[PDB]
Write a protein that binds this DNA or RNA. Sequence first.
RNA 1: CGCUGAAAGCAUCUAAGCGGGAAGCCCGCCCCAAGAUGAGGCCUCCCACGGCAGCCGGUAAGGACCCGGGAAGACCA
RNA 2: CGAUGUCGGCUCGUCGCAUCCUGGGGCUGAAGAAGGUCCCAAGGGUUGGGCUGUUCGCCCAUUAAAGCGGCACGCGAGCUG
Lengths: 140, 37, 204, 16, 174
Amino acid sequence: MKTYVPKQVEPRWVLIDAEGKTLGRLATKIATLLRGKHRPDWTPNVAMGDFVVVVNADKIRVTGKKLEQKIYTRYSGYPGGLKKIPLEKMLATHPERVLEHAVKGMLPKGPLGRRLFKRLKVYAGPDHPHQAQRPEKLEV
Amino acid sequence: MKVRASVKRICDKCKVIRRHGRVYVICENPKHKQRQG
Amino acid sequence: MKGILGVKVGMTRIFRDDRAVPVTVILAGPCPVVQRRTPEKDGYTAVQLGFLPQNPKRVNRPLKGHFAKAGVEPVRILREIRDFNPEGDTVTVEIFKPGERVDVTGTSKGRGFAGVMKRWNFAGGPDSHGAHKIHRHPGSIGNRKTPGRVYKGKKMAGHYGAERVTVMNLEVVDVIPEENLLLVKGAVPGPNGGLVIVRETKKA
Amino acid sequence: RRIRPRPPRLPRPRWR
Amino acid sequence: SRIGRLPIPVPKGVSVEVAPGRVKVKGPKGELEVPVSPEMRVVVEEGVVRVERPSDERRHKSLHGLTRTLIANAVKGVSEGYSKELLIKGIGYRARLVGRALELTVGFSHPVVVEPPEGITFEVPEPTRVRVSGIDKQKVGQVAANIRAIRKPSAYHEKGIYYAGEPVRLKPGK
RNA sequence: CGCUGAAAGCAUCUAAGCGGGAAGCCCGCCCCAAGAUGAGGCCUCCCACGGCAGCCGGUAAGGACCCGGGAAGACCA
RNA sequence: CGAUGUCGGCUCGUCGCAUCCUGGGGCUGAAGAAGGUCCCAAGGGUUGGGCUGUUCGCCCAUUAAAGCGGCACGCGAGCUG
Ligand SMILES: [Mg+2]
Ligand SMILES: [Mg+2]
Ligand SMILES: [Mg+2]
Ligand SMILES: [Mg+2]
Ligand SMILES: [Mg+2]
Ligand SMILES: [Mg+2]
Ligand SMILES: [Mg+2]
Ligand SMILES: [Mg+2]
Ligand SMILES: [Mg+2]
Ligand SMILES: [Mg+2]
Ligand SMILES: [Mg+2]
Ligand SMILES: [Mg+2]
Ligand SMILES: [Mg+2]
Ligand SMILES: [Mg+2]
Ligand SMILES: [Mg+2]
Ligand SMILES: [Mg+2]
Ligand SMILES: [Mg+2]
Ligand SMILES: [Mg+2]
Ligand SMILES: [Mg+2]
Ligand SMILES: [Mg+2]
Ligand SMILES: [Mg+2]
Ligand SMILES: [Mg+2]
Ligand SMILES: [Mg+2]
Ligand SMILES: [Mg+2]
Ligand SMILES: [Mg+2]
Ligand SMILES: [Mg+2]
Ligand SMILES: [Mg+2]
Ligand SMILES: [Mg+2]
Ligand SMILES: [Mg+2]
Ligand SMILES: [Mg+2]
Ligand SMILES: [Mg+2]
Ligand SMILES: [Mg+2]
Ligand SMILES: [Mg+2]
Ligand SMILES: [Mg+2]
Ligand SMILES: [Mg+2]
Ligand SMILES: [Mg+2]
Ligand SMILES: [Mg+2]
Ligand SMILES: [Mg+2]
Ligand SMILES: [Mg+2]
Ligand SMILES: [Mg+2]
Ligand SMILES: [Mg+2]
Ligand SMILES: [Mg+2]
Ligand SMILES: [Mg+2]
Ligand SMILES: [Mg+2]
Ligand SMILES: [Mg+2]
Ligand SMILES: [Mg+2]
Ligand SMILES: [Mg+2]
Ligand SMILES: [Mg+2]
Ligand SMILES: [Mg+2]
Ligand SMILES: [Mg+2]
Ligand SMILES: [Mg+2]
Ligand SMILES: [Mg+2]
Ligand SMILES: [Mg+2]
Ligand SMILES: [Mg+2]
Ligand SMILES: [Mg+2]
Ligand SMILES: [Mg+2]
Ligand SMILES: [Mg+2]
Ligand SMILES: [Mg+2]
Ligand SMILES: [Mg+2]
Ligand SMILES: [Mg+2]
Ligand SMILES: [Mg+2]
Ligand SMILES: [Mg+2]
Ligand SMILES: [Mg+2]
Ligand SMILES: [Mg+2]
Ligand SMILES: [Mg+2]
Ligand SMILES: [Mg+2]
Ligand SMILES: [Zn+2]
């Protein structure tokens, strides 16, 4: 007998409210949902995890003094092109990237890895445009 | 202001405070003001 | 933020108060507006100006259809001016009076494949004292094993010119509205007969 | 800046 | 030996009303909103308000005294009000009102205008006395320090702007 | 450098909070830039073609080729 | 050691900051001007000559200043020699 591998399944849609949630402790469960490791028929070689819509990513919460001390970082390739950006300003200017970055580094590297990052759809503010899918609201 | 690694009182009117993660020493005689560093 | 399209025509010096002022002359007007960018429609705010009338033969259907939504005759060049919403539906040289200061944007004279001396003002090598076939050469371009590579944006020979250049805060010396001319003190990018953009300056 | 002069290790590449 | 527990006498008749994280203090001179840590408890008694701590550790002993003087200074604000005086010294220096602003002549190449912010009133009796008048205690000492900053007390002479009662310690010149 | 201020009846720029403060940091200026595969937006143009998410053909709006050239340019563009 | 070309110059730089100048500062045995001292700050800038192969240094005339250092004592499939 050989281990069941599934006929490719249709995904599930999922809405999460990021308000008041700690950054890393939402990022972990979101990354699990993306990987489909909440599924009894999980198959490591295919993308079967759900789609995850995140709302109120601006009101994501954070412990310690991170708001001023967490530094997201970028290298442009030129001499001097290391840019430091504190979490404070990241939230004021691109508040969806906070959750998107955190969630990223907890997703495998590689094609399937960077293919799942596109099945996460983080939004600031309380609404999202993915009404057509009618995502089951998940509590985490 | 004196910056050093040994901030001590110098006179009896000297005061040892710790503001913003650093030990200062403030006093009415300005030559006594000290930050640690 | 007023702006107008025009061609650069040539340079001269007029005289003004016992002082000779170098000028370059720009055939500015007139520029019919053919589309308006609004925050509802397009997110930002800008006016699409046209310039130089064009032989209706040489204008395809889609382009010709664009003009018809606005009732503008086929024109040669279309260009936007950002954060400009003029009252009329024709921008002319009248929006500039003398004393004002302008920014002029134009495609510079292309110098083609430029060596490291003409392009980046390098010094090259000696012309005697032993110099060996490196007279117009750049020299070192790196270090050694560390980093063992060349920095991005390392200034080298290559193409130079025929790029956009905005020269700023030029005094508007005169305006000849009958001729759609526009005097401008100093130098303006581009060759004679090249299309420039004249805008209200951003200085103080 | 090294104060003691550093002796060379190679002779000048001499035509064979 | 304890500021946090000393009750706050409420004059007649200023209202103190309690809310989460804030207490409002209406009064004949205005109103002021005082923010109160939800760890401290503000209780309205007969013509007296009182503050209590929910424990006996460092942060609760600290929030106690602070929130007390905060409500205390809020009550003196909407009843008596607050005021500081500044004493211009030095031969050239003087000051005058201009409608509502304050024009200081303290020896620059220019006078210095100061625009009073909301809730602050400028008064000039003598031309060497300026009076910062306001209901908000912290806002008053602010503005006064701002004005004194414009020409702080020199260290070698008796000229500048001096706080009412500020001593005049100088050092020798030669 | 301060304001207001406890723990610590005083004091303290701080433990709650708020000011002020560098050619430096972030925006601003100029230039590149949707291969930004996350490949965006707007205006406009053609449109149900014939035969067994496919295929083979004829077309539409357009485009390319070739030619005269150009302060564009090594060829290409 | 079946080769990792070696000083100095030229050229092209880039980085660090134990900061020469410019900016912001506290103490001063700070009257003022001008200094000393320490703190923050690496954005930009940091001249031309005489001497010696010289780096270094001394000197001339200036300057806001004439910083010190890493990059195989940066850089010979770039040049010099
Ligand atoms: Mg998987
Ligand atoms: Mg935080
Ligand atoms: Mg792996
Ligand atoms: Mg000692
Ligand atoms: Mg004291
Ligand atoms: Mg152009
Ligand atoms: Mg040149
Ligand atoms: Mg050049
Ligand atoms: Mg040049
Ligand atoms: Mg030379
Ligand atoms: Mg030469
Ligand atoms: Mg030779
Ligand atoms: Mg030879
Ligand atoms: Mg050669
Ligand atoms: Mg030769
Ligand atoms: Mg080499
Ligand atoms: Mg490397
Ligand atoms: Mg070009
Ligand atoms: Mg000028
Ligand atoms: Mg000509
Ligand atoms: Mg033309
Ligand atoms: Mg040496
Ligand atoms: Mg041989
Ligand atoms: Mg008190
Ligand atoms: Mg005077
Ligand atoms: Mg105090
Ligand atoms: Mg605080
Ligand atoms: Mg002040
Ligand atoms: Mg500020
Ligand atoms: Mg400047
Ligand atoms: Mg562009
Ligand atoms: Mg595209
Ligand atoms: Mg584009
Ligand atoms: Mg990317
Ligand atoms: Mg893809
Ligand atoms: Mg597109
Ligand atoms: Mg858009
Ligand atoms: Mg050209
Ligand atoms: Mg060609
Ligand atoms: Mg050609
Ligand atoms: Mg060897
Ligand atoms: Mg051997
Ligand atoms: Mg070998
Ligand atoms: Mg060999
Ligand atoms: Mg070899
Ligand atoms: Mg020499
Ligand atoms: Mg300095
Ligand atoms: Mg200074
Ligand atoms: Mg000093
Ligand atoms: Mg002095
Ligand atoms: Mg003196
Ligand atoms: Mg330092
Ligand atoms: Mg610097
Ligand atoms: Mg000689
Ligand atoms: Mg010798
Ligand atoms: Mg020597
Ligand atoms: Mg000097
Ligand atoms: Mg100086
Ligand atoms: Mg010199
Ligand atoms: Mg160097
Ligand atoms: Mg070397
Ligand atoms: Mg060689
Ligand atoms: Mg050499
Ligand atoms: Mg080599
Ligand atoms: Mg020889
Ligand atoms: Mg020899
Ligand atoms: Zn003392």
